Write a protein that binds this DNA or RNA. Structure first.
Lengths: 62, 59, 63, 60, 59, 62
DNA sequence: AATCCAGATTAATCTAATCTAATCC
DNA sequence: GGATTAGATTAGATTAATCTGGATT
DNA sequence: AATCCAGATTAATCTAATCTAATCC
DNA sequence: GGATTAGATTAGATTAATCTGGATT
């Protein structure tokens, strides 16, 4: 049960899935449907998505 | 290609930073350090600084 | 560039706060509400709390 | 009781690693994986890197 | 092999060393010994001494 | 004002010939300028262009 | 329509991992 | 100079608070 | 007294870092 | 408006011409 490590690869896959849906609409369940990465949980993604949204809000939009 | 969008909040931080250094004397590295915005680059600040100087010269 | 100094008095107020909450349930925000010390941030307390927990964990006085 | 001695060799290895990441953004964990030296811990590298930053920052 | 950057602090030490020596006794090697800055080279201060002399000439 | 210099095909060609004639040891700004003999062109025009030229070749050479 | 509510998401906050400054030897 | 300790930072986890779609009234 | 010569000094000139303007989306 | 490329500016580095103190002739 170890901590997720958001590598550039995994983050890339997350980014791709979020763009498919729209950063405004993306939710953890539908991000994971697309990512197809087993062992990755909804909370895992939710926490990353919030961190992602904070980052994009400063640089624009979102 | 994630463009920066200069929202009211981020432009305002830029205005405070540039005004602390002086409009004509402000350089991107110093503006970037004062703003302390993760992900923001020299080229972001420099491109926005150029349009800001045009806009200020028309006044 | 200011760094917090956990003086003996400050650390004792922190311990008084943590014992009032229970070291199990204690979290930085509630600790700061009790301590009533301006200038301390939640990050200052969370760093100190983690060192305190590391120490207590070896001696077994915490989960 | 064994202290690490930063021989010229080893320091050069460390400088090479640090230059490969960037002095400002280098951290002990990345330095160690580049250096690939068994025997060296994070703390050995972090102590050396503190002293190294002191020296370089006085010079800019 | 790092370029030197002349900070406010390092430059302050330079001016005090120049002023103490008197321009000129203020030459690089002796300015360097006064500053006693690890890694600062004779050439670092010789180059800075040159631009400073130009700077003083313009008042 | 002074006009910004624009490195046209013809002006760049003359700089390239000068560089190649001198070699890299002697291809410093003042000598490139003497060979090019174009009125109003300055050291800093050449030095600026020389720095971009050297980056451009290091890329080519790898 | 209007309400209930379990589940989902999201903001707020926590905390482990790791870093870096301060201090020690 | 190098080790150790104390406090700061970052990324990811957990908790608390909202939200909403679907069932019910 | 005068010359030699390493080890400097110093002006001239170069060059990397960083900048701003021009131009492209 | 924001990104990218080309040419400009600046600070620091390097080179080249000159100078000098201590030894020597």
């Amino acid at each position: 049960k170890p901590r997720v490590v958001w590598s550039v690869e995994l983050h890339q896959q997350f980014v791709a899935a979020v763009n498919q849906l729209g950063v405004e609409k993306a939710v953890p369940k539908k991000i994971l449907e697309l990512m197809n990465v087993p062992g990755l949980t909804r909370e895992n993604v939710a926490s990353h998505l919030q961190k992602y949204r904070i980052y994009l809000r400063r640089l624009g939009g979102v």
